[PDB]
Amino acid sequence: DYKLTYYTPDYTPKDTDLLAAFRFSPQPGVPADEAGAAIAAESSTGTWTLLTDMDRYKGKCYHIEPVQGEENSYFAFIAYPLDLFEEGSVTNILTSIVGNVFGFKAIRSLRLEDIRFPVALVKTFQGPPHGIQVERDLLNKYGRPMLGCTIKPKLGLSAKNYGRAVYECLRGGLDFTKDDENINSQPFQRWRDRFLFVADAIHKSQAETGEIKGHYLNVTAPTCEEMMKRAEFAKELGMPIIMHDFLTAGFTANTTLAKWCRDNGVLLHIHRAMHAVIDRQRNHGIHFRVLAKCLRLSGGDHLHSGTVVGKLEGDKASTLGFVDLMREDHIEADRSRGVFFTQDWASMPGVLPVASGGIHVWHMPALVEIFGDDSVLQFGGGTLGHNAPGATANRVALEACVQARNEGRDLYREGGDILREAGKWSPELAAALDLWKE
Amino acid sequence: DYKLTYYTPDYTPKDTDLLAAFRFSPQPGVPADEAGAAIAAESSTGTWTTVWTDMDRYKGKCYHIEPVQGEENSYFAFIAYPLDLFEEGSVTNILTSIVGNVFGFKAIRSLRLEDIRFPVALVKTFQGPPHGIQVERDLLNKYGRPMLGCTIKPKLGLSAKNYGRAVYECLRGGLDFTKDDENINSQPFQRWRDRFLFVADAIHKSQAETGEIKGHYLNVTAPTCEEMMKRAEFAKELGMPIIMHDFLTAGFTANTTLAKWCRDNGVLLHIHRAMHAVIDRQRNHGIHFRVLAKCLRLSGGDHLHSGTVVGKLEGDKASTLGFVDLMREDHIEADRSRGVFFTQDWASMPGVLPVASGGIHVWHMPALVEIFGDDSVLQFGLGHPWGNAPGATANRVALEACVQARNEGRDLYREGGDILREAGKWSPELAAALDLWKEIK
Amino acid sequence: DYKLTYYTPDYTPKDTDLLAAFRFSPQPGVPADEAGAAIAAESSTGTWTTVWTDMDRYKGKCYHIEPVQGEENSYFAFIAYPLDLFEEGSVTNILTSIVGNVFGFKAIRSLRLEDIRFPVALVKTFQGPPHGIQVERDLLNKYGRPMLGCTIKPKLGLSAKNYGRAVYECLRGGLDFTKDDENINSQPFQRWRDRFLFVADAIHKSQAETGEIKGHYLNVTAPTCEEMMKRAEFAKELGMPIIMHDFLTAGFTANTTLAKWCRDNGVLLHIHRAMHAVIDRQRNHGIHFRVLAKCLRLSGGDHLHSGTVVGKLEGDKASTLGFVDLMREDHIEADRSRGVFFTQDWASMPGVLPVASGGIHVWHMPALVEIFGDDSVLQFGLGHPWGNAPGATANRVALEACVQARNEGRDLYREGGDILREAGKWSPELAAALDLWKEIK
């Protein structure tokens, strides 16, 4: 029995408690209150744990409600005391919250929809190495989303061919290029060679345009010291931003890399590889809200937030939810956007959302309207065009959409119209204007 | 669309290929063939993005597609990846390449990576477990029986001196290991260095009065790899035989770093699988735990939590036997009744001890001894009201009795109750352990 | 002039704000309101210098002004500072922001910072005491009684060998700590490394013949942090349980550095409050010592000199009780009779042992045991002409007798003389200690 002490409905949280919102489907035969109390007891001191007042450490299931629309499915809000978590350790927060409960037998399925970090805990973490304002200042790109080119003809490329591809795509006018998430250092292309040649390309680009251009050099490595080798060498070459896969590599390695980046002034682009393994099924896993929050705490300036270019259910709203759970300082609780708790970030900076892709410039106005101009749009299409032409197309189209947005004009009814209006100053943009013709 | 080049059902996999067996339920509206080809395309190089040298030597290839027996709109897909796609010695790169972004594929509605076959040409470039079963038994000098453990409880709220006292009482009782809790790294009520000092004092005190080699899985999971290296090196300085790490929360970068450190510095590395059920519970999505057991054996770890078996009321115990043999033997045949889809040859890389934990008491002792054999650890994480040293003595008497009964020639699965109730005639601790739990099978 | 924006008497302070309670006497010619607003303006961003983004979110705000009861032209002013103004983990930045340049304000003629409330969101970003009361009692294994100490005298002019002999004679007598003098760092007559060698030899010799854990507050205050790190690391190498530091002369940068070092290396850090009276004596100017006790508990220190109480003829002992509870408990209510202006919640950060020193002899023993309780240190810095080992034995007998009398159920404040004069029947050292001092209350 757990409800006797772990279910306190008349309890109110403190401003120094960690609040966790679970969505759980219980096994046929157990009531929602018993299962919620059990979730509370398993993510903290369990039953039979005694001689001390082991009550200031117990989690407490302070709320249980039935979710509207689904049968045998509930939300459970649980409150953990602040003195259970190691300061500055995302790994400990996780292995305390989600370390044990998901394999509870008396529950058919469990999902962690949101989690509220107290300010008394947000303060301990370093946070994003730079944030949004700082990284805009470092790159000197104001009032416009940043543009990204993914070099997708990726594996069969020699290091020098990779370098020329990066150089030409950046010469067209993008701001960043991106190493694919699964290219660290492999027989066909070792890491140090790619670093050398993309650094040469970046310097050639900055020399001929005058703008600060970069490349998310992937430093995800088998060990932390090898990762540090790669990061140190990337800095030695003068690279302004590196890349990391926080879920595959881990949170220990990512926290280490973030602390190193803060101390060395390189922006840390985060790629959410392996994420769908734990957030796709609405009945089990960990919602990407929790992972975006855990990242903002651990460290990272950019974060892949996916895209909304047709997956537009109430689900799309959920995206918006977390996309300002990591850009704002205060977020009000409104379950219509999936934000279960109000989160105060204590002036910790925000991370930049990265648009999944769609090199197709027909939702670019839609993306400028959704993610705003404080975001990165990563056209993961290899810069098709017909290269430098596709790059110029993307850049000119972005500048057109943002100039139209600044003029009080709509970009959901006037999207194709403004794109066609812009396509008449350059043939490259004309070669790719709307939902077709790529 | 994809099937023309990524679906080669005639292709046979080389011995130098990486074989993945996905279990996917496709969206209503697409054939299993196109979806398997799409998985192969997205996990390896996809989208035909070959503008700029023919990358057809890097593509994965869905070389098999079959419908799973006894379920509708669900299939298995076997895909083969060239050896050249993976960085040598990097589990993280294997994961990022295989399970990078195919789980969020639209045309599939559910995807679960059920197995991977690592070619010997790739098993050979990982360090593997720091020590393995034989070396670890030699270091501890404990032969011919499973190893015993206890998770110290009260879990939280114990003063470091009290935590040390508890550890000393357990180990003095007759166990071989005590286990720091999963979520105890360093918290206001108990900082890590204090815990380490006092449990090391306890370990030495108990080794003195016993002569055996006791140990404690000192949790070194830390917010940064600098900090976990500090914790591990302070554990070595104290002369600690074994440390602990949570390989899934912490990650594989950190776990590989720690495994290399442990090999260089001669400490056994116990692995705890916290956060796993976030992945390996739903039979229709996630990553089957056997893939993670293989990836651990590659990355590094001497022990690994393998859950428990029909000792705990269980269904598919064939799957748990399968991945126990995957992390413990050297050659395993593709016996798909035991969940093993591919024949995995380990190339003399050592074995990882399975740790049986979670809802175990003295009555489960015989079953486990039959299931895991003697190359395993049994963590008895209720509290045998006589104390904790009596509970340790009871568990020790039970294990030694069951082991001598097994090596005697008895059928322990049919005579476990009898051998335990007969051994209880010479150790009141075990008698209390027997009449506490109501002989749950 | 200032009052229009910096004086918000309606504003209520957030739980994430830093509250300062100044006690100011303004110049004849300005109202208390304008002066409080001016304090708020000068300590936080002032002068309205907002040429180049509205900084009204960073301004301090004088949210309260009251006249002090029983004194003319003197007021209290409560000011609130946003959490965003202070660097996390930096006591020096807290001091530089709060008490930076408001004390030299013209319109005020006297200013005294009487208290600060640290928000939990800011207490959580400091390390705090390296160990705290519970951990330090565990390390020393001394429970249920205060700790005893002696300052070694002759203060100066002792050869390191003689210093070692003195320390050994004290500790062998039955004390728990000896204390290096305040101003003995390393001087021609006695260099530090020699002192360390010989007192370490003495500590080991006395631990041998006693079985208890003796110690010596080795003064590591040095001209540079390099040199104090050298001294601290040589003290650790010798296996010294505890070192010493003068946090006010040396500073808070150096004391925080040393506190982090002590946490990483498991030595208790005794703090001595030399140079304090330069600040916390005049009731009309300076910084009340409770602010410095809070700032120390933040920065780091296991022990802290808290002066003495009506054991020494005293007036406002309520204030000393107040800041003893400020550095020793976890939650303190705003009981302004005890000098505590704000309710301070410490968020499980450990406690700092108060050290009672200065003009104490055996007759004060009961009073102190009632005042500080048993979580405190008593430094008995005249010389019990029998020697120094007999004086140590006398102090030990007195403390144990008074502690067993307290736990027995006696009223030690009314029966201290009786219990001491009765215990003197079984220890001639204590009899000499009794008939030396003429039972000064």
Side-chain angles (χ1 to χ4, degrees):
Chain A
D1 185 25
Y2 308 96
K3 185 180 170 179
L4 77 165
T5 176
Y6 283 94
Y7 189 57
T8 61
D10 43 7
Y11 164 92
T12 180
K14 312 174 179 182
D15 289 332
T16 78
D17 271 4
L18 197 80
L19 308 177
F22 292 105
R23 152 182 296 170
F24 71 111
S25 300
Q27 289 281 1
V30 296
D33 58 3
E34 171 186 359
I39 300 183
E42 297 304 322
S43 54
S44 80
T45 178
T47 46
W48 318 292
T49 323
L50 302 91
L51 274 297
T52 51
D53 203 329
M54 63 178 182
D55 295 332
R56 43 173 316 178
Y57 305 105
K58 312 168 87 76
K60 282 180 161 53
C61 169
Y62 76 94
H63 197 35
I64 282 179
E65 78 183 41
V67 60
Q68 293 177 335
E70 289 79 1
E71 300 84 3
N72 194 33
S73 180
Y74 306 85
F75 283 125
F77 303 83
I78 312 191
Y80 302 100
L82 189 70
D83 49 42
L84 293 189
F85 315 116
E86 170 174 12
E87 321 92 356
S89 175
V90 167
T91 69
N92 176 224
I93 289 172
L94 280 188
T95 189
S96 294
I97 304 313
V98 311
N100 191 19
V101 292
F102 284 72
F104 197 53
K105 285 309 166 186
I107 293 166
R108 283 192 49 225
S109 69
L110 181 64
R111 179 183 177 82
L112 183 55
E113 289 279 2
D114 195 349
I115 181 177
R116 189 213 64 173
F117 302 107
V119 292
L121 195 79
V122 160
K123 212 74 178 182
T124 78
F125 291 87
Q126 154 172 305
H130 299 66
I132 294 187
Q133 297 85 6
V134 186
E135 73 92 27
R136 284 198 168 280
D137 296 333
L138 291 190
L139 313 166
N140 194 24
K141 313 294 186 44
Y142 291 107
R144 168 174 46 84
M146 286 142 183
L147 280 200
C149 180
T150 315
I151 301 311
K152 284 186 76 175
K154 51 184 174 291
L155 306 182
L157 273 196
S158 73
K160 186 183 183 184
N161 294 324
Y162 207 85
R164 285 203 70 250
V166 169
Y167 163 66
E168 193 68 28
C169 195
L170 282 185
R171 189 60 167 99
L174 269 70
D175 297 327
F176 303 107
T177 58
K178 166 173 164 284
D179 273 13
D180 188 298
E181 71 267 8
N182 63 350
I183 294 173
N184 320 336
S185 85
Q186 287 140 347
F188 51 90
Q189 171 176 176
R190 300 292 182 185
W191 66 267
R192 191 190 158 99
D193 301 330
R194 171 175 77 257
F195 282 33
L196 276 171
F197 288 118
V198 311
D200 186 13
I202 282 180
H203 291 344
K204 260 193 184 58
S205 299
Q206 282 194 212
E208 302 164 7
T209 77
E211 296 168 330
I212 292 181
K213 303 201 167 306
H215 180 109
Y216 315 153
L217 287 174
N218 192 345
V219 310
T220 318
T223 59
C224 287
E225 56 265 13
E226 171 79 9
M227 178 182 65
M228 281 303 123
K229 276 192 192 184
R230 313 194 184 192
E232 293 267 356
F233 179 56
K235 175 188 177 42
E236 156 181 335
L237 301 164
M239 288 300 102
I241 171 166
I242 61 188
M243 184 178 162
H244 191 61
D245 296 359
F246 79 110
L247 268 179
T248 57
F251 276 118
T252 294
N254 189 84
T255 306
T256 286
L257 192 61
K259 282 188 177 295
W260 181 97
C261 288
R262 155 73 69 76
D263 293 330
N264 292 255
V266 292
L267 307 173
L268 177 57
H269 176 111
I270 298 295
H271 188 123
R272 58 159 193 185
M274 202 191 147
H275 83 282
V277 183
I278 48 186
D279 51 280
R280 170 165 180 161
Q281 314 301 313
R282 282 190 179 80
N283 56 317
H284 199 97
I286 290 177
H287 198 301
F288 195 66
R289 270 187 293 279
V290 181
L291 298 181
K293 283 178 147 195
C294 281
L295 179 89
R296 183 175 190 185
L297 284 192
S298 165
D301 304 356
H302 311 183
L303 174 60
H304 273 253
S305 65
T307 185
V308 280
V309 295
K311 58 182 73 175
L312 274 51
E313 292 82 2
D315 159 75
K316 171 223 162 190
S318 71
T319 284
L320 296 199
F322 78 77
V323 81
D324 70 2
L325 261 181
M326 70 188 198
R327 270 196 308 194
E328 323 302 330
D329 190 3
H330 200 238
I331 301 94
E332 269 67 17
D334 42 353
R335 315 260 293 277
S336 67
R337 310 177 78 197
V339 190
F340 284 67
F341 314 97
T342 180
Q343 180 75 58
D344 193 0
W345 281 112
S347 180
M348 165 177 292
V351 317
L352 277 195
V354 178
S356 175
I359 176 177
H360 301 169
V361 55
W362 52 258
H363 45 273
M364 159 182 276
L367 264 39
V368 169
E369 291 293 325
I370 295 300
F371 289 90
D373 54 353
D374 273 348
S375 179
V376 181
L377 314 187
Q378 191 63 45
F379 290 135
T383 309
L384 295 175
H386 64 87
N387 52 347
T392 59
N394 299 308
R395 171 79 178 280
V396 175
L398 181 67
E399 292 178 352
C401 305
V402 67
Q403 190 53 279
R405 180 198 54 75
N406 284 117
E407 293 296 329
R409 300 181 70 250
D410 169 87
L411 278 73
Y412 261 118
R413 298 285 78 78
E414 297 291 329
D417 195 359
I418 192 65
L419 276 167
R420 298 190 237 289
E421 174 192 309
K424 302 298 184 289
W425 324 124
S426 66
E428 294 84 4
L429 183 46
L433 282 167
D434 201 48
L435 281 75
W436 291 280
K437 190 177 57 64
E438 188 72 31
Chain B
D1 177 23
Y2 280 118
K3 192 186 169 183
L4 80 164
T5 181
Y6 287 100
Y7 184 65
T8 71
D10 55 357
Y11 163 91
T12 181
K14 315 167 187 176
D15 289 330
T16 172
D17 272 332
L18 198 142
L19 308 189
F22 295 100
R23 169 170 182 164
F24 75 116
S25 177
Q27 292 282 7
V30 287
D33 300 332
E34 182 208 329
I39 297 184
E42 305 301 329
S43 79
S44 67
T45 172
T47 326
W48 305 277
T49 311
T50 78
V51 177
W52 189 352
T53 184
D54 182 2
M55 276 70 75
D56 291 334
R57 46 164 307 171
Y58 298 112
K59 300 171 148 94
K61 281 165 165 46
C62 192
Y63 77 95
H64 198 31
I65 286 188
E66 79 185 29
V68 59
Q69 293 177 335
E71 207 285 348
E72 292 82 3
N73 191 32
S74 161
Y75 308 92
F76 282 126
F78 302 84
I79 307 188
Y81 302 106
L83 189 63
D84 294 330
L85 294 182
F86 310 102
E87 169 174 2
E88 322 91 333
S90 175
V91 168
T92 71
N93 192 229
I94 287 180
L95 282 196
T96 302
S97 295
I98 308 311
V99 309
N101 65 338
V102 294
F103 287 74
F105 200 62
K106 275 70 64 179
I108 285 91
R109 98 177 167 198
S110 90
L111 181 62
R112 168 186 186 79
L113 174 74
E114 285 275 1
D115 200 331
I116 296 176
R117 193 212 64 177
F118 298 102
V120 168
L122 188 67
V123 173
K124 280 300 291 198
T125 180
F126 290 87
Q127 156 173 312
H131 298 55
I133 304 175
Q134 280 79 33
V135 189
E136 177 269 4
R137 287 194 164 277
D138 296 334
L139 288 199
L140 304 170
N141 190 9
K142 296 167 182 305
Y143 296 111
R145 67 168 179 78
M147 302 172 170
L148 279 196
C150 183
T151 309
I152 291 303
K153 284 162 186 178
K155 183 176 309 307
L156 301 173
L158 268 181
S159 87
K161 246 278 203 34
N162 276 307
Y163 206 88
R165 284 158 184 141
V167 168
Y168 167 72
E169 277 308 321
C170 268
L171 296 182
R172 184 65 181 98
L175 299 197
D176 295 324
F177 302 107
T178 54
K179 186 216 163 204
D180 266 23
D181 196 71
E182 307 90 8
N183 48 43
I184 294 193
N185 309 330
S186 168
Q187 288 108 17
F189 55 92
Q190 174 181 175
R191 300 290 181 187
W192 68 270
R193 195 195 160 95
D194 310 347
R195 179 173 84 242
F196 283 32
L197 289 171
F198 288 101
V199 310
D201 184 20
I203 279 182
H204 292 338
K205 271 196 188 70
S206 64
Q207 277 203 27
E209 317 176 2
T210 311
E212 300 177 351
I213 301 196
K214 307 302 197 188
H216 185 90
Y217 315 155
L218 286 170
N219 195 347
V220 307
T221 321
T224 45
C225 65
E226 273 80 351
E227 179 80 14
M228 94 168 173
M229 284 286 100
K230 281 201 320 183
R231 299 178 192 199
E233 301 192 319
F234 181 56
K236 169 177 184 42
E237 155 185 339
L238 297 168
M240 287 291 100
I242 176 167
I243 64 181
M244 200 179 87
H245 196 230
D246 295 332
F247 82 110
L248 266 168
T249 58
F252 277 120
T253 301
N255 187 83
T256 305
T257 291
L258 183 66
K260 285 188 176 301
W261 183 92
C262 295
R263 188 191 208 81
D264 293 333
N265 291 252
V267 296
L268 322 165
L269 168 58
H270 175 117
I271 299 294
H272 187 99
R273 58 163 192 178
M275 193 186 166
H276 79 294
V278 187
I279 287 171
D280 61 87
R281 176 158 190 173
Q282 298 308 307
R283 278 181 172 79
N284 53 303
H285 194 89
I287 296 180
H288 198 300
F289 181 66
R290 84 178 52 92
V291 175
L292 298 175
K294 284 183 159 199
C295 279
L296 183 79
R297 176 167 200 190
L298 284 199
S299 168
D302 298 10
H303 309 188
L304 170 60
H305 277 264
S306 68
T308 171
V309 193
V310 290
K312 175 263 298 181
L313 275 297
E314 188 63 282
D316 55 4
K317 87 155 189 175
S319 177
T320 191
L321 289 202
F323 75 82
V324 167
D325 278 301
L326 271 183
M327 56 180 271
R328 199 161 63 166
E329 320 296 336
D330 182 39
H331 193 57
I332 302 94
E333 275 67 27
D335 179 353
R336 279 188 48 189
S337 68
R338 319 221 304 169
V340 187
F341 289 75
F342 308 110
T343 180
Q344 180 66 73
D345 190 337
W346 279 113
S348 296
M349 174 171 293
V352 180
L353 288 178
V355 181
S357 66
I360 319 182
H361 45 90
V362 72
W363 282 114
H364 295 171
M365 182 75 74
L368 291 174
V369 166
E370 181 205 20
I371 290 158
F372 289 96
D374 55 355
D375 289 340
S376 67
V377 196
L378 315 178
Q379 276 300 335
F380 294 123
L382 185 148
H384 189 282
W386 272 30
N388 204 0
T393 301
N395 300 309
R396 184 63 174 270
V397 176
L399 180 63
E400 61 88 19
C402 291
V403 157
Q404 75 154 340
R406 172 186 56 88
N407 294 117
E408 186 274 332
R410 279 154 156 256
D411 180 288
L412 75 165
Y413 180 64
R414 292 290 86 193
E415 294 179 353
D418 260 348
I419 187 64
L420 271 178
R421 291 192 299 267
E422 198 278 332
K425 301 288 99 175
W426 294 294
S427 68
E429 310 78 356
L430 180 58
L434 289 163
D435 67 355
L436 198 159
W437 293 274
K438 276 73 177 174
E439 202 267 325
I440 294 91
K441 278 76 177 176
Chain C
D1 177 23
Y2 280 118
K3 192 186 169 183
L4 80 164
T5 181
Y6 287 100
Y7 184 65
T8 71
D10 55 357
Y11 163 91
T12 181
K14 315 167 187 176
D15 289 330
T16 172
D17 272 332
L18 198 142
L19 308 189
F22 295 100
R23 169 170 182 164
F24 75 116
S25 177
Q27 292 282 7
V30 288
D33 300 332
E34 182 208 329
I39 297 184
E42 305 301 329
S43 79
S44 67
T45 172
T47 326
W48 305 277
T49 311
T50 78
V51 177
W52 189 352
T53 184
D54 182 2
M55 276 70 75
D56 291 334
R57 46 164 307 171
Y58 298 112
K59 300 171 148 94
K61 281 165 165 46
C62 192
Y63 77 95
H64 198 31
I65 286 188
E66 79 185 29
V68 59
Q69 293 177 335
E71 207 285 348
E72 292 82 3
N73 191 32
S74 161
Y75 308 92
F76 282 126
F78 302 84
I79 307 188
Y81 302 106
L83 189 63
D84 294 330
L85 294 182
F86 310 102
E87 169 174 2
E88 322 91 333
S90 175
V91 168
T92 71
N93 192 229
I94 287 180
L95 282 196
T96 302
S97 295
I98 308 311
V99 309
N101 65 338
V102 294
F103 287 74
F105 200 62
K106 275 70 64 179
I108 285 91
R109 98 177 167 198
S110 90
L111 181 62
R112 168 186 186 79
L113 175 74
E114 285 275 1
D115 200 330
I116 296 176
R117 193 212 64 177
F118 298 102
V120 168
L122 188 67
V123 173
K124 280 300 291 198
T125 180
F126 290 87
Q127 156 173 312
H131 298 55
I133 304 175
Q134 280 79 33
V135 189
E136 177 269 4
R137 287 194 164 277
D138 296 334
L139 288 199
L140 304 170
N141 190 9
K142 296 167 182 304
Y143 296 111
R145 67 168 179 78
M147 302 172 170
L148 279 196
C150 183
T151 309
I152 291 303
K153 284 162 186 178
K155 183 176 309 307
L156 301 173
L158 268 181
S159 87
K161 244 247 206 150
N162 270 287
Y163 211 78
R165 282 194 208 93
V167 168
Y168 167 72
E169 277 308 321
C170 268
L171 296 182
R172 184 65 181 98
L175 299 197
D176 295 324
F177 302 107
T178 54
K179 186 216 163 204
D180 266 23
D181 196 71
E182 307 90 8
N183 48 43
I184 294 192
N185 309 330
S186 168
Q187 288 108 17
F189 55 92
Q190 174 181 175
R191 300 290 181 187
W192 68 270
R193 195 195 160 95
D194 310 347
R195 179 173 84 242
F196 283 32
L197 289 171
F198 288 101
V199 310
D201 184 20
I203 279 182
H204 292 338
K205 271 196 188 70
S206 64
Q207 277 203 27
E209 317 176 2
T210 311
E212 300 177 351
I213 301 196
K214 307 302 197 188
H216 185 90
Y217 315 155
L218 286 170
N219 195 347
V220 307
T221 321
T224 45
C225 65
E226 273 80 351
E227 179 80 14
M228 94 168 173
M229 284 286 100
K230 281 201 320 183
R231 299 178 192 199
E233 301 192 319
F234 181 56
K236 169 177 184 42
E237 155 185 339
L238 297 168
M240 287 291 100
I242 176 167
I243 64 181
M244 200 179 87
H245 196 230
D246 295 332
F247 82 110
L248 266 168
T249 58
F252 277 120
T253 301
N255 187 83
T256 305
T257 290
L258 183 66
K260 285 188 176 301
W261 183 92
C262 295
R263 188 191 208 81
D264 293 333
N265 291 252
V267 296
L268 322 165
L269 168 58
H270 175 117
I271 299 294
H272 187 99
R273 58 163 192 178
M275 193 186 166
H276 79 294
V278 187
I279 287 171
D280 61 87
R281 176 157 190 173
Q282 298 308 307
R283 278 181 172 79
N284 53 303
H285 194 89
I287 296 180
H288 198 300
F289 181 66
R290 84 178 52 92
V291 175
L292 299 175
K294 284 183 159 199
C295 279
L296 183 79
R297 176 167 200 190
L298 284 199
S299 168
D302 298 10
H303 310 188
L304 170 60
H305 277 264
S306 68
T308 171
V309 193
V310 290
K312 175 263 298 181
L313 275 297
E314 188 63 282
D316 55 4
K317 87 155 189 175
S319 177
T320 191
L321 289 202
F323 75 82
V324 167
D325 278 301
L326 271 183
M327 56 180 271
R328 199 161 63 166
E329 320 296 336
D330 182 40
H331 193 57
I332 302 94
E333 275 67 27
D335 179 353
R336 279 188 48 189
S337 68
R338 319 221 304 169
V340 187
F341 289 74
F342 309 110
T343 180
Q344 180 66 73
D345 190 337
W346 279 113
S348 296
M349 174 171 294
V352 180
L353 288 178
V355 181
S357 66
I360 319 182
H361 45 90
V362 72
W363 282 114
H364 295 171
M365 182 75 74
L368 291 174
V369 166
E370 181 205 20
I371 290 158
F372 289 96
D374 55 355
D375 289 340
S376 67
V377 196
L378 315 178
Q379 276 300 335
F380 294 123
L382 185 148
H384 189 282
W386 272 30
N388 204 0
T393 301
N395 300 309
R396 184 63 174 270
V397 176
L399 180 63
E400 61 88 19
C402 291
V403 157
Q404 76 154 340
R406 172 186 56 88
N407 294 117
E408 186 274 332
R410 279 154 156 256
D411 180 288
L412 74 165
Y413 180 64
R414 292 290 86 193
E415 294 179 353
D418 260 348
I419 187 64
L420 271 178
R421 291 192 299 267
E422 198 278 332
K425 301 288 99 175
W426 294 294
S427 68
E429 310 78 356
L430 180 58
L434 289 163
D435 67 355
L436 198 159
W437 293 274
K438 276 73 177 174
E439 202 267 325
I440 294 91
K441 278 76 177 176

